[PDB]
Amino acid sequence: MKEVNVRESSQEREQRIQQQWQKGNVFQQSVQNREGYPSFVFYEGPPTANGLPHVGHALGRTIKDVVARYKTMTGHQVIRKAGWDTHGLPVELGVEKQLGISGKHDIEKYGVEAFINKCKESVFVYEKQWRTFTEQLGYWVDMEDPYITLENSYIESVWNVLGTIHDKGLLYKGHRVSPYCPSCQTSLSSHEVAQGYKDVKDLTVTVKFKVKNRDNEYFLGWTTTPWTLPSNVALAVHEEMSYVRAEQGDSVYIVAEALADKVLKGEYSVLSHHKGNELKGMSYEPPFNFVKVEKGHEVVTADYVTDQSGTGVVHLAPAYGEDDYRVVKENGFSFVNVVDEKGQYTSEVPPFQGRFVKDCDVDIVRYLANQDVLYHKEKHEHSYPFCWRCDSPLLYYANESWFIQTTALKEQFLKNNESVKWYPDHIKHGRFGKFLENMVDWNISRKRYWGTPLNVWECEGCQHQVAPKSIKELQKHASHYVDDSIELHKPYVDDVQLTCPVCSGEMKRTPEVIDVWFDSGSMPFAQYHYPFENSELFQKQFPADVIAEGIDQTRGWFYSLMAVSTLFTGKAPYKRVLSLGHVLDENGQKMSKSKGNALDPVDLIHTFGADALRWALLADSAPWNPKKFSERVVQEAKSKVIDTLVNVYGFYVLYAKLDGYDPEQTYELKKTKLDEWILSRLHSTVKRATVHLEDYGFTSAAREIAVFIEELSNWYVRRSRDRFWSEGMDGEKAAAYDTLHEVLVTLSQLLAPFTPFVADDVHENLTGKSVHLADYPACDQTKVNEKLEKEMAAVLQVVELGRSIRNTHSLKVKQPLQSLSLVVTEEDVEWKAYRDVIKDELNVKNFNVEQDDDKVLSYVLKLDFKQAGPKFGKQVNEVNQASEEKGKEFVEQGKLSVTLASGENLTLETEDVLVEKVPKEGFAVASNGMYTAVLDTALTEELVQEGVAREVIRAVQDYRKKLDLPVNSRINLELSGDEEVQKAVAKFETLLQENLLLHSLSVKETIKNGETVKVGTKQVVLRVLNQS
Ligand SMILES: C/C(=C\C(=O)OCCCCCCCCC(=O)O)C[C@@H]1OC[C@H](C[C@@H]2O[C@H]2[C@@H](C)[C@H](C)O)[C@@H](O)[C@H]1O
Ligand SMILES: [Zn+2]
Ligand SMILES: [Zn+2]
């Protein structure tokens, strides 16, 4: 065993262990040694090296590493794989911001290829910081062998999945309506929309839609957006609502019965009543007829039509509203869109072509009035959403896009989710399950340059679609040569055309790339270039036994993994999900870039060590409970767990080497109750931490281990130091070494998944072998002694009571007191087996176990005027409750009743008496639960003297340490002090001789070149010197 510097910094210890791991090839050995054992599989959600790692990564990688180490130690082979998610809109946006250009014209003016190369360059800028973070956190993985989503082989596997999906007919071109900025040409989120409202005055109109082949009858439709009127496709009514034919002069208007008084201006006669279902299929004339709608201009019924707004008859334009889109499609009516991506009318609306639609509202209302189809108009004051980024007005707009018809497999999604164990449980049928229940199809295409190209080619002749699954298929179908080296990115693949298998015309690739969530959801198949290679490795690494990422992946990676795998294989790609809460600052605010309140994990590792950071990320709350993180939280883990272990470990190594202890020898062993207690607690801890870890309960396993470490240091080691300091090697000393040796070996194994650096420092020094090649320890049931555990815990309650009495009266522990006395009802605990440990801990001369109070307390008895409500003889209970007083009170305490005689009669008291235990002169009392402790706080000259001598001893031990003297050396000591110090030292000379290693001790009047130290509040000069 090498010596231990308990003051060695964490950074130095962890770098030393890291060097052992490289020298011993320990990570790779930990995997090879499990060749043949069952496989345990985990997937990491691939991060990106265009940003620095943050404490969110540190939380998730600590949890994955704990699981991997634990499953390795319990008999599994755990292959570790990392990857980089390199496509993704932020990459492209960062290059646009760096170059100062945007939009298709400027990027192509710049050169697509050159633009693509900047994106490539931007994604690994922080690779070196990622390597340092990964290594220093102790997250074992080969960073020379990542998968990378921009590599051809990765992309080729993604194309293979997409082509398989296309084969099933599940990949289609469609439209989806969303809030949309016509200036930025992008769809905004609800949160983005909520940020940008603004108040406006515009026009709403009630429009006449003439009924075909009737005399002067019209549906009336109300709208807030006149510019959608040239694109009318249908009128919707509610099946069950009541409608009237209302006559006004020469015309008849059809509106809802309940809205007619509001919507019609002036009086009307009701000609007839109709349910909306009777209006279904009625043909009408639209207000404009230049846009072609092949199927439409009829009334349809739809449940969302209400009696609370408009006329009850709703104009539908399917490209400018989500309900409009759905209802038109439900009825098999034509989809039309007469507005371009800039919010401008196309050539399909000739009189307004090229103008921004909202700018045309006034001109359309003038046209309606000029054409006699405007029934009513009014000024409208309301709030309208604008673009935070340019305050252009927003629009409801349908872009054309590619979709995967995931809804076609909704039932398989739900079945696969049912097979997953979620942590916490409620995510399964809550956040995640409800997202599945409300599934819409996956909008897969993106109109940008950097990303996985969507591998769909369309014939310019007949629009037939071919989707190459591979480079070989691309080359086979291409109408020209395609080199083996073709890069699967834009623009290279846009220059490849195929021969249409239907008509032999030219096929051109659709221009879009795919959603980055599809790349990362494809990682179970693409990470190993499946099915082109590695089919055995893939099958062994599918599905994952566990993943662990933030709960924000509910609609992200958790969903894209499930969706890609369900589409491709039908199967769930993971068996369990550990969800993580986003880390908070000490104020409970989420850590974010903009606020500057994040704590860098590499900073925290440098200050406190990775063991302490990992512990702080695992302890005191579950992974899915957001942590209020601070440096103080890491410091507490370092002090309570890391440093405490290191100090116990260094104590063992120091004394084992001094005494030449060797676990290989057989010694005569007399084990004490303390030895048996800590070995029992150790195996109880093994048992309980294992159960928790089997269920992924790191928090409770951490808690169990921390309690053990505290008991080990604060009770077992503290109350056994005398056996280690002893001269010789009797049976009780050998038992101490034997016991603490086993404790440290087993505890370092237990800790190995949590705190892998210090665990291996302890284990390798004691055993010569890396802890990370060990098996997780087994509980030895024969060393579990629940009776001893329950006994020692009662002993600890009494120690706590004694200490609290001392603290209450400011009586230092070094100051001996005459006695502690304990009064117990039950003969529950064998107190004589722990008397010496109790007297040592509490520094009392006598420990008395009492069944009674008599010698210790007197009882004062009052009547309880609150409970003695009935008894009207309060003058009698006053005199009856006012030597003989001591005898009568002790009598009523034990018997729990009382019989006092009034002025003539006798009454029977019970629970109507308030009792006061008054400590006798010089005693102080405290109680909890079953136990009452009474401390004799009376100091005497001789007790005070002995305390002074105990403080001299401790001052000498401290000074020897400050001089860095070995603990086994004998010294010549000079001491100078006041007359009380001189006299205490002479009187307790043999106590000093027995507790200090001394060649001589000279009390001198004055000392040359001594050092002044504190003995209590006294100043004493000490000198250590040489003498022949
Ligand atoms: C718990 C989380 C963040 C957190 O706790 O963040 C707290 C710290 C944020 C502070 C940022 C500011 C740092 C710099 C500064 O000071 O300015 C969320 C998790 O993040 C980690 C992982 C990210 C992977 O990419 C996701 C993959 C799965 C997907 C395919 O893309 C993932 O598990 C994610 O769910
Ligand atoms: Zn905008
Ligand atoms: Zn064709």
Author numbering: 1 to 882, 887 to 1032
Paste lines from the article.
Mupirocin, a clinically used natural antibiotic, inhibits isoleucyl-tRNA synthetase (IleRS), an enzyme that links isoleucine to its tRNAIle for protein synthesis. Two IleRSs, mupirocin-sensitive IleRS1 and resistant IleRS2, coexist in bacteria. Specifically, type 1 proteins (IleRS1) are strongly inhibited by mupirocin (Ki in low nanomolar range), while IleRS2, which are homologous to IleRSs from the eukaryote cytosol, exhibit resistance to mupirocin concentrations that are about three orders of magnitude higher. AARSs catalyze the formation of AA-tRNA in two steps within the same active site.
Therefore, to deepen our understanding of mupirocin resistance in general and to infer the mechanism of hyper-resistance, we determined the crystal structures of wild-type PmIleRS1 (sensitive) and PmIleRS2 (resistant), both of which carry the canonical HXGH motif and are amenable in mupirocin-bound form when the inhibitor is supplied at sufficiently high concentrations. It is this lack of carboxylate stabilization by H-bonding that may strongly affect the IleRS2 affinity towards mupirocin and provide resistance. Interestingly, we observed a kink of helix α2 (from residues 123–126) solely in the crystal structure of mupirocin-bound PmIleRS2.
